[PDB]
């Protein structure tokens, strides 16, 4: 499950093939297609992944698996 509190976790939604606006159909981390009802997380660069897959990835790497943009928080009171 999530290792962050809900209000600190990346935003997420459940995949629905009937109303899916994104160009992505594939979780590249596990190389498996998105399926209806699966929980996806979306990074600040707008790339999306299965929640379980990207959580692991970001703990180890901090960067988006696809574009390598750092998904870390931009904090008000630190650099
Ligand atoms: Zn995956
Ligand atoms: Zn990205």
Numbering used by the authors: 387 to 465
Copy text verbatim from the article accompanying this structure deposition.
RING family ubiquitin ligases (E3s) employ the RING domain to recruit the E2 thioester ubiquitin (E2∼Ub) intermediate to catalyze the transfer of ubiquitin (Ub) to substrates. A cationic Arg linchpin (LP) residue in the RING domain plays a key role in stabilizing the interface with E2∼Ub, but the identity of the LP residue varies across E3s. Notably, the position of a cationic Arg residue in the RING domain is conserved in most structures of RING E3/E2∼UbD complexes, where the Arg side chain forms a network of hydrogen bonds with UbD and E2 to stabilize the closed E2∼UbD conformation. We chose the RING domain of RNF38 to use as a model monomeric RING with a native LPArg.
